[PDB]
Amino acid sequence: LSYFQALPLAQRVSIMVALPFVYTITWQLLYSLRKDRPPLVFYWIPWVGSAIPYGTKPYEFFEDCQKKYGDIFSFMLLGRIMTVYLGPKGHEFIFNAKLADVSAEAAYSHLTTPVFGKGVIYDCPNHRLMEQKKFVKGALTKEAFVRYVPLIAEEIYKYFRNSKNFKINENNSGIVDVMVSQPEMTIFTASRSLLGKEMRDKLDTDFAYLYSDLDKGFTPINFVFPNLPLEHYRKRDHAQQAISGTYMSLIKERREKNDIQNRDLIDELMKNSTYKDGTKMTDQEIANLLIGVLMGGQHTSAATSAWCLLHLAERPDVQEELYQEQMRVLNNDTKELTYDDLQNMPLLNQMIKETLRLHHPLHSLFRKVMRDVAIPNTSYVVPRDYHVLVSPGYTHLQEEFFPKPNEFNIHRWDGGDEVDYGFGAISKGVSSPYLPFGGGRHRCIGELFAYCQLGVLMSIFIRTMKWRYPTEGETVPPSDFTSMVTLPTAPAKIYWEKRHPEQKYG
Numbered sequence: 001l002s003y004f005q006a007l008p009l010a011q012r013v014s015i016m017v018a019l020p021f022v023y024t025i026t027w028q029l030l031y032s033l034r035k036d037r038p039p040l041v042f043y044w045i046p047w048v049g050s051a052i053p054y055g056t057k058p059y060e061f062f063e064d065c066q067k068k069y070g071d072i073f074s075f076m077l078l079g080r081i082m083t084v085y086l087g088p089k090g091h092e093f094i095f096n097a098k099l100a101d102v103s104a105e106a107a108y109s110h111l112t113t114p115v116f117g118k119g120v121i122y123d124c125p126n127h128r129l130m131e132q133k134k135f136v137k138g139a140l141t142k143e144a145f146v147r148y149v150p151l152i153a154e155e156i157y158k159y160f161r162n163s164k165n166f167k168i169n170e171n172n173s174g175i176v177d178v179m180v181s182q183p184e185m186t187i188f189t190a191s192r193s194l195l196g197k198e199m200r201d202k203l204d205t206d207f208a209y210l211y212s213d214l215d216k217g218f219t220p221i222n223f224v225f226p227n228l229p230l231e232h233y234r235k236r237d238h239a240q241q242a243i244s245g246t247y248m249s250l251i252k253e254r255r256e257k258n259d260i261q262n263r264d265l266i267d268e269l270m271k272n273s274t275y276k277d278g279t280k281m282t283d284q285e286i287a288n289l290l291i292g293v294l295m296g297g298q299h300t301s302a303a304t305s306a307w308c309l310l311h312l313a314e315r316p317d318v319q320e321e322l323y324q325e326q327m328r329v330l331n332n333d334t335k336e337l338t339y340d341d342l343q344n345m346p347l348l349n350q351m352i353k354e355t356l357r358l359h360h361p362l363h364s365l366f367r368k369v370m371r372d373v374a375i376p377n378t379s380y381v382v383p384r385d386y387h388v389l390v391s392p393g394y395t396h397l398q399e400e401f402f403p404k405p406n407e408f409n410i411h412r413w414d415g416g417d418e419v420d421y422g423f424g425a426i427s428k429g430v431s432s433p434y435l436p437f438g439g440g441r442h443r444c445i446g447e448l449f450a451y452c453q454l455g456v457l458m459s460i461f462i463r464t465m466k467w468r469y470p471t472e473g474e475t476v477p478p479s480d481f482t483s484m485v486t487l488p489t490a491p492a493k494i495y496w497e498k499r500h501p502e503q504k505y506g
């Protein structure tokens with residue numbers, strides 16, 4: 001190092017920028033000597049790790065890692081080490097892990113707690129979240145869906161009429177960007193049914209911008225830096241307070257009038273948000289919980305109906321097959337749609353089921369390791385402070401589980417023990433290769449709402465329109481895996497025409 005100082009400046013600079021790369025390469029060579037750790041995927045760039053391949057093609061990244069290291073491998077991701085366990089055995093290891101070994105709230109809270117607010121979901125012990133899930137299910141019964149279906153349909157028909165994306169009472173055909181239309185239709189239908197009429201109407205005012213601001217705070221870049229003094233972090237914090245304050249205001253007005261019925265999720269939480277220990281949720285916490293429930297249905301559902309429309313755009317045979325089922329179940333379109341009719345549209349539901357296979361909206365689910373965990377039938381130990389990463393969406397796309405996994409075939413769906421974590425009996429095992437809604441204690445409680453919402457929506461699209469791509473030979477767009485959910489690359493335009501030009505919608 002006395003030789004170093006004699007070198008020309010450009011060399012001394014080269015050596016000094018090279019030093020971090022040599023140090024991390026050296027540290028990875030020393031790391032591979034531990035046989036009690038999963039293989040660490042090799043990476044060139046200090047700290048960044050494998051962010052680029054993982055962030056842009058996670059399933060292809062996983063597949064190449066699998067061929068080289070097996071089902072269990074670690075990778076460096078923006079200063080954090082993620083341990084992946086691919087396949088059914090991984091579903092079981094992670095989704096069914098013990099509370100003492102891994103924590104979802106420790107992995108997610110710095111991202112969700114500023115968006116939803118304090119005291120609920122991931123800003124509370126797990127046993128409280130189990131009971132919050134039980135409360136919310138009180139508004140997700142069959143009887144609730146019976147009520148929701150005509151409200152969701154009414155919202156969709158208003159949208160067809162009023163939205164500049166359609167204006168369907170004046171145009172017989174059009175081009176629409178499903179990445180514009182579907183997020184909007186999703187928030188209108190979920191508002192009207194879960195928050196009710198008062199809150200749905202506020203979306204016709206400038207209040208709607210607050211939801212947009214709240215959404216902007218909900219990006220994966222908040223996983224790494226949950227708080228910067230940035231403008232859009234400020235707008236997010238304002239929105240959470242303005243929105244939750246508005247829900248509390250509505251909650252209070254209802255309590256004064258005793259206007260507490262069986263209409264929406266606000267009614268349900270006002271009547272049934274008392275924990276087993278006799279304590280109960282505050283209005284601020286009810287409002288924060290409402291924010292989280294709506295947000296959990298927003299991106300997953302909008303992404304999914306966008307993919308349905310796109311896969312059907314290139315399949316007029318499937319559109320026609322679904323249209324035939326619609327005419328059988330709804331008596332040639334003389335019966336108003338009801339929840340029982342959706343339960344009798346098997347092909348419609350297989351179409352949603354198949355879209356969710358091809359496009360799981362959440363490609364990666366995470367838990368933080370809370371104490372060293374041995375991995376059964378390996379020599380690996382995953383140490384405290386790593387993260388484990390489970391990816392059912394990877395298994396959806398695997399030839400071993402689904403022959404010709406990239407083909408959209410709704411007829412592949414032609415056709416154990418239970419455990420109660422506190423929100424109802426669910427499947428005890430999670431070894432299925434197909435888990436669009438997760439499994440174990442953190443499993444989705446919105447699955448039937450999603451089928452209800454998506455089912456009304458696709459039922460009405462099929463009965464009202466035919467559509468295709470605007471250019472011949474165009475196909476399904478590629479996915480963008482960098483956002484909250486995997487969603488199609490925008491814009492994603494389809495050409496539609498009314499099946500009944502004379503029909504007026506409202």
Ligand SMILES: CC[C@@H](C)n1ncn(-c2ccc(N3CCN(c4ccc(OC[C@H]5CO[C@](Cn6cncn6)(c6ccc(Cl)cc6Cl)O5)cc4)CC3)cc2)c1=O
Pocket residue numbers: 051052054055056108112121220223292293294295296297300362364365366444446481482483484485
């Ligand atoms: C620098 C290069 C660049 C290309 N790059 N480098 C890295 N990345 C990247 C990394 C990771 C990701 N991922 C990982 C995180 N992921 C994600 C994982 C889980 C998740 O949510 C799980 C929890 C929290 O939110 C919900 C979602 N939900 C559940 N049911 C329906 N939605 C949730 C649960 C309950 C409630 Cl009430 C609300 C919500 Cl939102 O569950 C959201 C996003 C998004 C993509 C994206 C990009 C990049 O883009």
Ligand code: HEM
Pocket residue numbers: 104129133293294296297298300301304361362365366435436437438439441442443444445446447449450
């Ligand atoms: C097609 C639509 C949807 C899909 C694919 C989906 C998927 C998922 C998945 C994979 C999880 C587990 C997350 C994990 O294990 O880390 C989950 C959890 C959850 N989702 Fe959904 N979801 C959808 C719609 C909805 C809707 C409509 C709601 C509410 C109305 C909702 C609310 C929730 C809640 C409350 C949880 C519990 C989180 C926990 O217990 O930690 N989701 N969802």
Ligand SMILES: [Cl-]
Pocket residue numbers: 169
């Ligand atoms: Cl009109």
Ligand SMILES: [Cl-]
Pocket residue numbers: 423424426444445
């Ligand atoms: Cl459930």
